[PDB]
Amino acid sequence: WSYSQTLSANIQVNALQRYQEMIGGGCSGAFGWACQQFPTTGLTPENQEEVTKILFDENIGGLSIVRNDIGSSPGSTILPTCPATPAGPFNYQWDGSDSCQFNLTKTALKYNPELYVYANAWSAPGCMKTVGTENDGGQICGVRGTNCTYDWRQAYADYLVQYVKFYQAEGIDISLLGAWNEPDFNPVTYESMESDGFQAKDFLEILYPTVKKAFPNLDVSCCDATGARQERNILYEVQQAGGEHFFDVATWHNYQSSPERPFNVVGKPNIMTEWADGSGPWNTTWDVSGQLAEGLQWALYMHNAFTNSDTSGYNHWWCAGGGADNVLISITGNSYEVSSRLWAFASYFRFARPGSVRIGATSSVENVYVSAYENKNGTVSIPVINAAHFPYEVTIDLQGLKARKRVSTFLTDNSHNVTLMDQSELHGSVLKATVPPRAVQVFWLE
């Protein structure tokens, strides 16, 4: 809702002030959701392509991250049968599908050659765990606080590297490798595995050098905690255990704690690798209810992560399929719907591409939010969020950008999906525009 009133906001953008390098937005097709996106029956191949294009085409959804589950369940793991001991031998199996995640990754790469693939195990194979199953939490055998018949850490590290080798042999490079999902949480009934930071360091000290031997440019994550606080605690313990240099990227989910402060790690980026409305009905609205599932709320949640916790990337939970509101695109039979959450993602990531660097951006109005990003090639994106219920006349002063010639204005609100509104020549270093209520307006500088 909105009403008639106008106020003004002053914004300063400064390319000389430089923060995190951005990675992108994304989503997962784990647990067979990739197969719902690529079912053959129901959704036609043309429509399967179109849904994947909508997500990963730079000009539409703008996403770049595909998060795949390194599966540990029957039919989803590269190690369906374990050897008796870590001495092996190991019989690795690849079916060319990977629960359709290979289809998702290959197709997304077709639409985005800069795809950033995150391969993330939810659990070690059961034989490698204290509980002897991939379900019900438990620990990698061999970390402190365990007493298995053998130490399985090297074997688990080798198994993760073998998963990466399967994708590499198909011509797909993995960018990030993770060994746990939500180690602070035991959901009991599906792939899970628990850890504190001392135990995680006991594994990372074997995983990290094992990975760099095979793939010197493959980054290692820690540790996909359910919330930012839980992630900070694991990071603290990893560093206290001596493992500061046994991971490269801090990963965390937004379910069980949200930050307003950076993470307790020096020289490492962080990615919010999973969040969704896990309980509500499927929802597409931008700003009708004000509920957390809506597109405008997701634009604001991202602004918070990128400006207050220096976050470099952001993932929805699932990409597309069923699961009510856990997807960005709902699929039913041969039909689909796009949530306007995707236009919140695109408002950032259609314009701030991989390798962009967040730069200084301030606003004189508390709920007229701004951030700004400078691509490797010098183009600059300034997503402004007018979270107020009436228009703001913004004045944007540009510093360090005298080389820019043109400005394009894009608008997302209840009647616009990243719509091009205006294109003009820059004839100084000041931009003036009226941003409608409850909207994201992106100023694209070239």
Ligand X SMILES: *[C@@H]1O[C@H](CO)[C@@H](O[C@@H]2O[C@H](CO)[C@@H](O)[C@H](O)[C@H]2NC(C)=O)[C@H](O)[C@H]1NC(C)=O
Ligand Y SMILES: O[C@@H]1[C@@H](O)[C@H](O)OC[C@H]1O
Ligand Z SMILES: *[C@@H]1O[C@H](CO)[C@@H](O[C@@H]2O[C@H](CO)[C@@H](O[C@@H]3O[C@H](CO[C@H]4O[C@H](CO[C@H]5O[C@H](CO)[C@@H](O)[C@H](O)[C@@H]5O[C@H]5O[C@H](CO)[C@@H](O)[C@H](O)[C@@H]5O)[C@@H](O)[C@H](O[C@H]5O[C@H](CO)[C@@H](O)[C@H](O)[C@@H]5O[C@H]5O[C@H](CO)[C@@H](O)[C@H](O)[C@@H]5O)[C@@H]4O)[C@@H](O)[C@H](O[C@H]4O[C@H](CO)[C@@H](O)[C@H](O)[C@@H]4O[C@H]4O[C@H](CO)[C@@H](O)[C@H](O)[C@@H]4O[C@H]4O[C@H](CO)[C@@H](O)[C@H](O)[C@@H]4O)[C@@H]3O)[C@H](O)[C@H]2NC(C)=O)[C@H](O)[C@H]1NC(C)=O
Ligand U SMILES: *[C@@H]1O[C@H](CO)[C@@H](O[C@@H]2O[C@H](CO)[C@@H](O[C@@H]3O[C@H](CO[C@H]4O[C@H](CO[C@H]5O[C@H](CO)[C@@H](O)[C@H](O)[C@@H]5O[C@H]5O[C@H](CO)[C@@H](O)[C@H](O)[C@@H]5O)[C@@H](O)[C@H](O[C@H]5O[C@H](CO)[C@@H](O)[C@H](O)[C@@H]5O)[C@@H]4O)[C@@H](O)[C@H](O[C@H]4O[C@H](CO)[C@@H](O)[C@H](O)[C@@H]4O[C@H]4O[C@H](CO)[C@@H](O)[C@H](O)[C@@H]4O)[C@@H]3O)[C@H](O)[C@H]2NC(C)=O)[C@H](O)[C@H]1NC(C)=O
Ligand V SMILES: *[C@@H]1O[C@H](CO)[C@@H](O[C@@H]2O[C@H](CO)[C@@H](O[C@@H]3O[C@H](CO[C@H]4O[C@H](CO)[C@@H](O)[C@H](O[C@H]5O[C@H](CO)[C@@H](O)[C@H](O)[C@@H]5O)[C@@H]4O)[C@@H](O)[C@H](O[C@H]4O[C@H](CO)[C@@H](O)[C@H](O)[C@@H]4O)[C@@H]3O)[C@H](O)[C@H]2NC(C)=O)[C@H](O)[C@H]1NC(C)=O
Ligand W SMILES: *[C@@H]1O[C@H](CO)[C@@H](O[C@@H]2O[C@H](CO)[C@@H](O[C@@H]3O[C@H](CO[C@H]4O[C@H](CO)[C@@H](O)[C@H](O)[C@@H]4O)[C@@H](O)[C@H](O[C@H]4O[C@H](CO)[C@@H](O)[C@H](O)[C@@H]4O)[C@@H]3O)[C@H](O)[C@H]2NC(C)=O)[C@H](O)[C@H]1NC(C)=O
Interface residues toward ligand W, by CB under 6 A: 284-285, 332, 335, 337-338, 340, 417
Task: Please give the full DSSP string across 81-107, using - where no structure is assigned.
Answer: S--SSTT--------S-TTTHHHHHHH
- 284: exposed, middle or buried (C-beta count within 10 Å: 0-12, 13-18, 19+)? middle
* Binder of Cl ion out of 165, 229, 268, 404 (CB under 5 A): 229
Q: How far is CA 120 from the centre of its chain?
A: 12
Q: Does 255 bind ligand Y (CB under 6 A)?
A: yes
**Nearest distance, CB of residue 346 and ligand U, angstroms:** 8
Q: Does 417 bind ligand X (CB under 6 A)?
A: no
Helix axes 197-214, 153-169, angle to 10 degrees: 40
- Contact between 313 and 26 (Cβ < 8 Å): yes
**Nearest distance, CB of residue 219 and ligand W, angstroms:** 33
Q: Does 149 bind ligand U (CB under 6 A)?
A: no
Among the listed ranges 139-147, 281-289, 345-353, 432-440, the one in contact with ligand X (CB under 6 A) is 281-289
* Binder of ligand Z out of 353, 369, 391, 392 (CB under 6 A): 353
Q: Between 44 and 73, how does the x/- string for binding to ligand U read (CB under 6 A)? A: --------------xxx-------------
* Binder of ligand Z out of 362, 420, 422, 430 (CB under 6 A): 420
Q: Does 103 bind ligand NAG (CB under 6 A)?
A: yes
Q: Of 265, 341, 266, give the one whose Cα is nearest residue 302.
A: 341
Report the half-sphere exposure of 26 (CA within 13 A, side-chain side): 30
Helix axes 101-111, 45-56, angle to 10 degrees: 60
State the pairing for strand pair 24-28/65-70. Answer: parallel
Q: Of 260, 263, 216, give the one whose Cα is nearest residue 244.
A: 263
Residue number, 275 or 349, with CB nearest to ligand U: 349
Q: Between 399 and 418, how does the x/- string for binding to ligand V read (CB under 6 A)? A: ------------------x-
* Binder of ligand Z out of 2, 12, 233, 379 (CB under 6 A): 379
Q: Of 338, 309, 335, 308, give the one whose Cα is nearest residue 418.
A: 338
- Contact between 24 and 302 (Cβ < 8 Å): no
Q: Does 4 bind ligand NAG (CB under 6 A)?
A: no
**Distance between CA atoms of 42 and 123, rounded to whole angstroms?**
31
* Binder of ligand X out of 109, 131, 214, 288 (CB under 6 A): 288
Residue number, 420 or 430, with CB nearest to ligand U: 420
- Contact between 383 and 349 (Cβ < 8 Å): no
What is the binding site for ligand X (CB under 6 A)?
283-285, 288-289, 291, 293-294
What is the binding site for ligand Z (CB under 6 A)?
58-60, 111, 113, 351, 353, 375, 377, 379, 406, 408, 417-418, 420, 423, 444, 446
What is the binding site for ligand Y (CB under 6 A)?
182, 185, 226, 255-256, 278, 291-292
